Design a protein around this ligand. Structure first.
Ligand code: OLA
Ligand code: OLA
Ligand code: OLA
Ligand code: OLA
Ligand code: OLA
Ligand code: OLA
Ligand code: OLA
Ligand code: OLA
Ligand code: OLA
Ligand code: OLA
Ligand code: OLA
Ligand code: OLA
Ligand code: OLA
Ligand code: LFA
Ligand code: LFA
Ligand code: LFA
Ligand code: LFA
Ligand code: LFA
Ligand code: LFA
Ligand code: LFA
Ligand code: LFA
Ligand code: LFA
Ligand code: LFA
Ligand code: LFA
Ligand code: NA
Ligand code: NA
Ligand code: NA
Lengths: 219, 222, 222
């Protein structure tokens, strides 16, 4: 079951990538950079999840290490997408964007180190990752939202919608991680696998459908 | 012999790097970034192949020359950056297209490494994903990236076309050698593969940048 | 004691990061990028040294302990430190990102040769070490030559600040390979505990000390 769920996920990622590629050819005022980011996220994730489907991107708790290889690239790119949405039609703040990238890469590395750790040490690393996530959300709903508001009512309305979308999904990851085999071990592996199949379909493909459709409608 | 071939390779990389350094001191309208990229590629490749010469950048698994992937994951995106910057010479940069090539290329090299670690059907899935990435890189090279070159005038576009064809002819030899040698079908012997992955990169790295830098320098006015 | 020294270091990195965050809130003409770099350096280093304090970021190898988390630290914190130095030289003028990325490439190479030297034994170790020292010498040539000439092109006052931080950085930087060679990774003349103390005290000055000196001096131009 675990193998065919990962093959299915990789196929959905490939269809999302092809959809974003088709949109890119009639871009309706959205810069090519947004289409490139929207394609890299699912292709990279698709490849990492294909490695799990093939029996390769895990070692035996089972550590699904290919998830961290995925997220360490896909998650900073998602925050770049969200930052570029806030900045659409205005000056870029690349400092703020790279602040999110740095927090996010740190967050994913702490999760990988937490997974390889035992006891108190595990929850130290996990806590540092959660703190990085809180700072990401403070930026999202604070200074980054203020840039979105500076770019007019329609853009700020779209940004708010994708900020809530992204944030609601993002808080689910560390919650599932803590409940599952990597943390307290209350949730079963098969549950956790389905959560880390379904959540990222929404976080990667769903998010960029919502984001690119909104930005395109501003044309 | 395999150790000595890697030492010789590393020495040629050093000479190439020092030659590009010397050109950089009299740049003839070529920006400093082209000289930097042309130096990093052979110095990085030189270090990676030195590790193979010393017996460190390889392991038994059949021998995996893993230091080749450490080499290519840096030197190959930089070579595509060089090609892209040639297409954009005298005109506006399209860094979105440049980074598209980087992303495709890093993915291609990683699928190679994973293919080398794999056995059976799995090996050929990773290899095929790498080949698809290469095909897209060549579609970009001869389609949108060439249209940028054509926008920068006749002489630049002629040079771009020479460099693009030179790169493409060498680049298709890599996955061809991979598939024929011990990592794939095991038709060619280890030594044969080693010599191909010594001689190809001398032309791909040092050769490419000699052609590219000389062609850009010739466009210089006074 | 080694564990407690690392906990104390991480705490000092966190206090430094918080000080730079507080300065960033009233920035006095210094761009946000300088404050971000000044925060990332100590947070990253603090995390890497936390892994040593917890007993994770080290292993036994040749009957000696490799503090591998130092190289994880330095491969990110050291290129950021050179970026901070380069941005100081360019303050009030056109950026030279080519020269900045030249220093980043040299620096990342230098740290990687150190890591490989640490994993090596005999002649091989000193080959890798020597390549990293060559990279450091080139970094220092850049720092006191072309990068200082950029600082001089941004006027007397900026160039005086640049020269101060260039000397500060360089004096600490030459200590690292010196300690490395004397200590258990090299000749084994200095004891493990001495090398641990050196690689605690030096980085407090290199990371937090450097950004205090750099940011105070830039803020005073306001
Ligand atoms: C945890 C990994 C650490 C990686 C560090 C990455 C971030 C630090 C680097 C600095 C980025 C600064 C960006 C400068 C852009 C200025 C232009 C602008 O603000 O629009
Ligand atoms: C050892 C690993 C090497 C990794 C770093 C490689 C860096 C090579 C890339 C070149 C960057 C070019 C900088 C862009 C130039 C813009 C114009 C300028 O301000 O000079
Ligand atoms: C490919 C693009 C990025 C994703 C790749 C990461 C997964 C790699 C897993 C390789 C492990 C192979 C070992 C084995 O065959 O058991
Ligand atoms: C649940 C996670 C907690 C944090 C959510 C975001 C915090 C509030 C955003 C800060 C608003 C602001 O800076 O004006
Ligand atoms: C949807 C179906 C509900 C199945 C149970 C939901 C997850 C509970 C967690 C667990 O028991 O591992
Ligand atoms: C840049 C080059 C990379 C060097 C890769 C080889 C490092 C492993 C050597 C360890 C050993 O001595 O076995
Ligand atoms: C690795 C994944 C690559 C994705 C990164 C985003 C592309 C960034 C391109 C910068 C755009 C500048 C404008 C331009 O010249 O097109
Ligand atoms: C490490 C980062 C790895 C990157 C992820 C790998 C997959 C990336 C490929 C996406 C590129 C597709 C863009 C092609 C369209 C460009 C065009 O229309 O000219
Ligand atoms: C579509 C583009 C993909 C082209 C790639 C070709 C893959 C080559 C096939 C591998 C040969 C298998 C031989 C064997 O398994 O014994
Ligand atoms: C920035 C974060 C850097 C942290 C670096 C390394 C983490 C240490 C790796 C975990 C080792 C697990 C413990 C063990 O080996 O028994
Ligand atoms: C392998 C590890 C490599 C990681 C290196 C970390 C990144 C290094 C430094 C780049 C900083 C560039 C900052 C440019 C600032 C421009 C501006 O402020 O306008
Ligand atoms: C090593 C010490 C640094 C030597 C600096 C020489 C200055 C170079 C120059 O003036 O261009
Ligand atoms: C002042 C320099 C400090 C170094 C002297 C202590 C050497 C101790 C040792 O041999 O372990
Ligand atoms: C391991 C680190 C990998 C990080 C992935 C890249 C994320 C940075 C994206 C920045 C995009 C800038 C776009 C400007 C327009
Ligand atoms: C571990 C490395 C990651 C740390 C990155 C630093 C994050 C700092 C956040 C930036 C603050 C700017 C707020 C503007 C209002
Ligand atoms: C027992 C587990 C408690 C872990 C504490 C986490 C510390 C917070 C981050 C520094
Ligand atoms: C044995 C119980 C372990 C549970 C540790 C809980 C982790 C803390 C979650 C929030 C992190 C700190 C918030 C800032
Ligand atoms: C970007 C490529 C990764 C660099 C690795 C260099 C060091 C390899 C040592 C392996 C043991
Ligand atoms: C997995 C390791 C990937 C590292 C990529 C190495 C960097 C190559 C791509 C960057 C090229 C820079 C071009 C900028 C030109 C602007 C003028
Ligand atoms: C057993 C020894 C056999 C070694 C044969 C290796 C042949 C090497 C040819 C490689 C082609 C290089 C391409 C250069 C293009 C100009
Ligand atoms: C070694 C690859 C071929 C180099 C010759 C190119 C000469 C170009 C002169 C203009
Ligand atoms: C240049 C950075 C090298 C440090 C990475 C070490 C991680 C694996 C442990 C050996
Ligand atoms: C004005 C010429 C600059 C030469 C710089 C001298 C060398 C600096 C050495 C620093 C290392 C301590
Ligand atoms: C920093 C001064 C150190 C002196 C060099 C020691 C060399 C020891 C060789 C035995
Ligand atoms: Na976006
Ligand atoms: Na070029
Ligand atoms: Na600075």
């Amino acid at each position: 079951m675990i193998s065919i769920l990962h093959y299915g996920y990789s196929f959905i990622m490939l269809l999302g990538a092809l959809y974003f590629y088709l949109l890119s050819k009639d871009p309706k005022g959205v810069p090519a950079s947004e289409y490139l980011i929207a394609m890299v996220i699912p292709l990279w994730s698709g490849a990492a999840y294909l490695s799990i489907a093939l029996g390769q991107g895990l070692f035996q708790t089972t550590i699904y290490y290919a998830r961290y290889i995925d997220w360490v690239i896909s998650t900073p790119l998602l925050l770049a997408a969200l930052a570029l949405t806030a900045m659409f039609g205005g000056k870029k703040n690349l400092t703020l964007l790279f602040s999110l990238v740095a927090l996010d890469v740190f967050m994913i590395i702490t999760g990988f180190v937490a997974d390889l750790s035992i006891g108190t040490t595990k929850y130290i690393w996990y806590s540092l990752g959660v703190i990085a996530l809180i700072i990401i959300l403070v930026i999202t709903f604070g200074p980054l939202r203020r840039i979105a508001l500076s770019n007019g009512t329609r853009l700020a309305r779209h940004y708010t919608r994708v900020a809530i979308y992204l944030s609601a999904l993002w808080v689910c990851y560390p919650t599932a991680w803590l409940l599952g085999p990597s943390g307290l071990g209350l949730a079963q592996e098969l549950t956790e696998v389905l959560v880390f199949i379904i959540l990222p379909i929404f976080s990667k493909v769903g998010f960029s459908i919502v984001d690119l459709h909104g930005l395109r409608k501003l044309h």
